[PDB]
Design a protein around this ligand. Structure first.
Ligand code: ZN
Ligand code: ZN
Lengths: 422, 237, 75
């Protein structure tokens, strides 16, 4: 109650200071006006303290208590990482996300002074870091617990290493933090692979995937049974990866230890991939400003193995046997204004179409773009107000008036015209 | 120096961290040193570092350990089976090296291959380019690497493996060949000479984006049974 | 009884669409040729140069809604 008094008092002082004239006396009416103007900020502060009352102890002309509460929370989360238990910390992080992200919203803090802005500048780095770590927990740690508990301790350690690689600069929309997170996730995967099998885990030297129905040998290299059946043709049962001297009487079978190991590493890779996808979507592709050039270039370089396509992933160990195309990064980039991202999208289209994954009759690929572009517009348009809806309809009329027409191919501006016209 | 060699091994032993069956290693090393056995073993003992081991050995298994680096290799250590160490690169290969296996290591560049290297196995390293090959290289296994180019092949390239690499074009495989494996490379086109080989060479090119016309060419040539060439394969499933 | 039928609509609906579109009652109508087939066969004015001047890029599309999501979840 004292802190809410201090907040509404500072709001009232600020509001009265703009009374068109000196503020000789602060009467009661202004208290209602301040409440009406700063209602959301105060309610959010109350919610914060309800979620994490301890913040009070951390606290002990301008409205700043909400930002100080947010800073206290991010500190009593960076220090209380995974306490009392990973689920309770994750759940606290999650609950606070909404009010903290509100406080880190520029519209929510319209008119904020220089102190509030300076606080929020750092609160945003802290929150982005805390959220990256929370997603790493939620996906890799918790899942590791049930599916692959042998690794739960190692992932716990890497949780804190993630917090530290984001500590200084936690804006993963930049290059350094994004590359650092990727380095961390690759080191975690490699170490987990070494844990699940101290001979490691390597893919079938025949199919270059992980050895479905694993068949180990006196040299411990792993292959698939079906691959060894096809391999067993004649005079060439001796492994390729090793050229071992084969006692011709050898006849293989399934070694359980490796199938369980591979299952564990596949669950691990799936969780790390889900973490990277969720980080990109929630953190990297969040702002009302598009990420830098180097981050997007790196993402597009990852989607293609040097070509073969794969799901959005930092690991060069999963691949779509057939050249599958998926809409993820297109849907993310289109969140922003097409005018900024068009060159990224055309580079993506040309890089797919560079005889890399598609050959001809690409009418279905273009429909993917056409639908993604249409989604962006629908996504934006459903946000518009009714007066904004009428203005938009006028702008579309003016575009239809302005539109007038190379062949044998399309471009992302042309496909965007097609989407808009549709 | 035998006293100093086992002494240094006991000294590294005092560094014995969890998992390291250094006791078993130390007995094996000392017996070999005093009996001057031509062979040593260190397999599966989860070692992370190697002191200098007896010189007069001509064979060694250090597989399934966790080393990240090797000391000088004895001049006589002809035969190494070092599969699954964590070596980030290979120190000096001695004069008489006749066989090496370096599977699942972390090497990225090899030292020079001696003249007597009748066999090499360096699978699953992270190499990008290979040193020169000797004329007597009866075997090269370089699969698992990231090689974008491949140096010439010697007189007697009997055995070859190249899977998981990035080789795009292959030097001429002479009649010395009897067992070729060349899958999942960057192969643009590979010569017809692979046909001239004997009637018993296994030749696989699966997983490659080879010239569709080159495959159709090789079918046209082989289905013209006039050739007494080897057994050639292109994919399985 | 019904669920088995709805499960297979992806297959069963193209069959009925074809049988209707190919009927003499309809196949001589241009609107049907526009809805079901490719009008390029019977419209000469239609450009054919740019991949964007195809028939599918100018085809219908699944309107995303809450109810469609609900159905998909149920499935
Ligand atoms: Zn396989
Ligand atoms: Zn082997």
């Amino acid at each position: 109650l004292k802190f809410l008094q201090m907040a509404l008092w500072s709001c009232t002082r600020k509001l009265k200071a703009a009374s068109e004239a000196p503020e000789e006396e602060v009467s009661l009416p202004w208290v209602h006006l301040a409440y009406q103007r700063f209602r959301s900020r105060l309610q959010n502060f109350s919610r914060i303290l309800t979620i994490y009352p301890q913040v009070l102890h951390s606290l002990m002309c301008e409205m700043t208590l909400d930002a100080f509460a947010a800073m206290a929370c991010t500190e009593m989360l960076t220090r209380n990482t995974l306490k009392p238990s990973p689920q309770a910390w994750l759940q606290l992080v999650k609950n606070l996300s909404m009010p903290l992200e509100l406080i880190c919203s520029d519209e929510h803090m319209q008119g904020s002074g220089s102190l509030a802005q300076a606080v929020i500048r750092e609160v945003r780095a802290q929150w982005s870091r805390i959220f990256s770590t929370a997603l790493f927990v939620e996906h890799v740690l918790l899942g590791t617990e049930s599916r692959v508990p042998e690794l739960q301790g190692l992932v716990t350690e890497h949780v804190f290493l993630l917090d530290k690689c984001l500590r200084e600069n936690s804006d993963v929309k930049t290059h350094g933090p994004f590359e650092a997170v990727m380095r961390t996730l690759c080191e975690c995967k490699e170490t987990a692979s070494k844990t699940l099998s101290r001979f490691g885990i390597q893919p079938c030297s025949i199919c270059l995937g992980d050895a479905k129905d694993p068949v180990c040998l006196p040299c411990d290299h792993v292959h698939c049974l079906r691959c060894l059946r096809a391999w067993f043709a004649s005079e060439q049962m001796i492994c390729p990866y090793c050229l071992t001297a084969l006692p011709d009487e050898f006849s293989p079978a399934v070694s359980q230890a490796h199938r369980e190991a591979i299952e564990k590493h596949a669950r691990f890779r799936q969780m790390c991939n889900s973490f990277f996808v969720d980080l990109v979507s929630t953190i990297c592709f969040k702002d009302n400003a598009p990420p830098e050039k180097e981050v997007i270039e790196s993402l597009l370089s990852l989607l293609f193995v040097q070509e073969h396509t794969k799901s959005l992933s930092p690991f060069n160990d999963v691949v779509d046997k057939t050249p599958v195309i998926r809409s993820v990064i297109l849907k993310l980039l289109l969140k922003y204004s097409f005018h900024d991202v068009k060159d990224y999208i055309q580079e993506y289209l040309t890089l797919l179409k560079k005889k890399a994954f598609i050959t001809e009759d690409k009418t279905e690929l273009y429909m993917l773009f056409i639908n993604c572009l249409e989604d962006s517009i629908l996504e934006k348009t459903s946000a518009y107000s009714r007066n904004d809806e009428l203005n938009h309809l006028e702008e579309e009329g003016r575009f239809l008036k302005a539109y007038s027409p190379p062949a044998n191919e399309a471009s992302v501006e042309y496909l965007q015209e097609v989407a808009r016209i549709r | 120096c035998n006293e100093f060699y086992l002494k240094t091994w006991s000294e590294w032993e005092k560094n014995g961290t969890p998992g390291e069956q250094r006791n078993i290693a130390f007995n094996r090393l000392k017996i070999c040193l005093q009996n001057q056995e031509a062979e040593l073993n260190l397999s599966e003992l989860d070692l992370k570092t190697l002191p200098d081991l007896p010189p007069q050995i001509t064979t060694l298994e250090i597989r399934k350990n966790l080393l990240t680096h090797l000391p000088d290799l004895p001049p006589m250590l002809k035969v190494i089976h070092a599969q699954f160490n964590q070596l980030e690169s290979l120190p000096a290969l001695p004069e008489t090296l006749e066989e090496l296996n370096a599977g699942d290591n972390k090497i990225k560049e090899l030292p020079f291959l001696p003249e007597n290297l009748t066999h090499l196995r360096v699978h699953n390293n992270r190499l990008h380019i290979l040193p020169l090959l000797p004329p007597e290289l009866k075997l090269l296994v370089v699969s698992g690497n990231r090689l974008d180019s491949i140096p010439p092949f010697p007189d007697k390239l009997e055995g070859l493996a190249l899977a998981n690499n990035f080789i795009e074009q292959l030097p001429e495989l002479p009649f010395s060949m009897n067992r070729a494996v060349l899958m999942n490379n960057n192969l643009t086109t590979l010569p017809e000479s692979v046909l001239r080989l004997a009637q018993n060479a296994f030749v696989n090119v699966a997983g490659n984006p080879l010239s569709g016309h080159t495959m159709r060419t090789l079918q046209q040539i082989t289905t013209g049974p006039d050739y007494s060439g080897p057994q050639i394969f292109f994919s399985m499933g | 009884v019904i669920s088995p039928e709805l499960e297979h609509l992806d297959k069963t609906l193209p069959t009925m669409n074809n049988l209707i579109s190919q009927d003499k009652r309809i196949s001589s109508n241009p609107v049907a040729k526009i809805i079901y087939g490719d009008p390029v066969t019977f419209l000469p004015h239609l450009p054919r140069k740019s991949v964007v001047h195809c028939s599918k890029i100018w085809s219908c599309r699944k309107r995303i809604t809450v109810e469609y999501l609900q159905h998909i979840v149920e499935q």
